[PDB]
Amino acid sequence: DLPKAEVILEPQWNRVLEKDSVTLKCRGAYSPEDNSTQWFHNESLISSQASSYLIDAATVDDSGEYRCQTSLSTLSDPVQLEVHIGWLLLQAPRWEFKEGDPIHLRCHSWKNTALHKVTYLQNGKGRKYFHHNSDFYIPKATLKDSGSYSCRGLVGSKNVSSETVNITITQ
Template sequence: MWQLLPPAALLLLVSADTPAADPSKAVVLLDPPWNRVLKNDHVALKCQGDYRVEDNSTKWWHNGTRISSQTSSYIIADAKVEDSGEYECQTGLSALSDPVKLEVHIDWLLLQATKWVVNVGEPIQLKCHSWKKTPVVKVQYFQNGRGKKYFHQNSDFYIPEAKLEHSGSYFCRGIIGTKNESSESVQIIVQGPGTSQTVSSFFPPWHQITFCLVMGLVFVVDTWLYFSVQRHLQNSEEWRNGKVTWSKGP
């Protein structure tokens, strides 16, 4: 299979699949570590990167627009819906960070997770967060509509080692005052060892390659036969007034 591609093309595919490591790239961290928050929550975004000795300022962007803050931490004391979006930062000796998405919701309950895409064996931590930290009792966590964990008092749902069957749609439910409230559902994806992208993912499956090669060969042979028959007819036929007369070929 590898012989089908010249070395230069193969090198391009490998380099395209393996992003270059950039240790100087800044990193945006959320504190607390939830990217989904409720209105009026307190959120701190912290920028990690290398600074010049004479300059410790930090540049921040929100949805591509520069923010006036120049400190290493960008504080949102009272989150609003318009604070939702992507945040990026950069320090004097670092490259621009990857964007971190923040979602601000309006609801009584919100399901939070440290990560929404996890690998097999990694922990999963879910939190049933209430608006303005209003007390919640009889909290229950659901996966794909089925109850998974119940707490009389509000507590985090912790899965020490994720398995493929832990993928699915999750939400939480609890009692606030006299009302039974539920969060909206969110998707958690657990990736197995075979789900990561490799160089082989650039190539189609073997049966597709075989089919394409066979069809190409059939096309070439069919084209050759067509022109060969045409030449033979031209040498063995004479068209006169719409009639065909046959002559003996060499």
């Protein structure tokens, strides 16, 4: 038998906002004879035959499972993509962490619109502040880093926030 292909996301974020570009890149081995890659979105076959698949401007309809397959691979396990609506989205490489892991949160704004006076909340309490937008790093995770998390700031003069998201810390 034959190894299964996998779908890679560039950028890596499993959650994105409408209008975000996202590139799905299929990785397996091709045959000499067959240069193609087939793409599924949920149950639908995507007509493009490309090595990698572009969602230039994401919509909520782009949400779901994505799989790919390459001329010398089995079909890929599915990869999940959630297109959210709004001004701000809290992005992270994932949401469960072991004690000691690094945590990298991003306070992504719709169309990269410049955001200032940015605060990252944990459990309804502002935790870290930046004057200009910046990612927030906890290089050594711990029991206390568990909670609900959001970010907010100002887009020009208007006040905005992300949906809140739970983070868990395991052993």
